[PDB]
Amino acid sequence: AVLDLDVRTCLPCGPGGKGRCFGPSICCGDELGCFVGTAEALRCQEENYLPSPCQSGQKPCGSGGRCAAAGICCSPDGCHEDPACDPEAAFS
Amino acid sequence: AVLDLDVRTCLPCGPGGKGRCFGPSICCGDELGCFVGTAEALRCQEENYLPSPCQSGQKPCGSGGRCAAAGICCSPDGCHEDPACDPEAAFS
């Protein structure tokens, strides 16, 4: 719960729908990271009907990318490595 | 075989090792696209022992990223959407 908005509807993607959809070909979960354009994010096509993200790691690093998943600074265009979420990006 | 280098050893990753390893947390295959930092690219850690890529899509678009997989312009840092490989990036 709580996303600096109102209601986090964390679009379920990946194997069993555990990941979250961030963009057209970009889906990143907590411990599933980001599948940048894959069969798992194919279901993200319905993210066009949802103009509200799900919280999201407030790690805007790189050329404008926030930490969307462990060790990956993704933005509304691509994905980028980021030392902030690199260490067992999760705490071990 | 085409190897504008010498020998394509296409590091097998993803489900059954069909994808290829491009970087530490970035693995993109032909029809598997790119898992930017995932359990599937975790095996890419051994890509440090291999300083030779595998061919790779010669489509350096974006801020220096080549087409590593359908509709994804990835570079030696991150991944980016690219209209060049967007259309059934493959030919249908």
Curated annotation (Swiss-Prot), chains A, B:
It comes from the Eukaryota. Disulfide bonds join 10-54, 13-27, 21-44, 28-34, 61-73, 67-85, 74-79. This is Neurophysin 1. The gene is OXT. The chain holds residues 32 to 123 of 125 of the full protein.
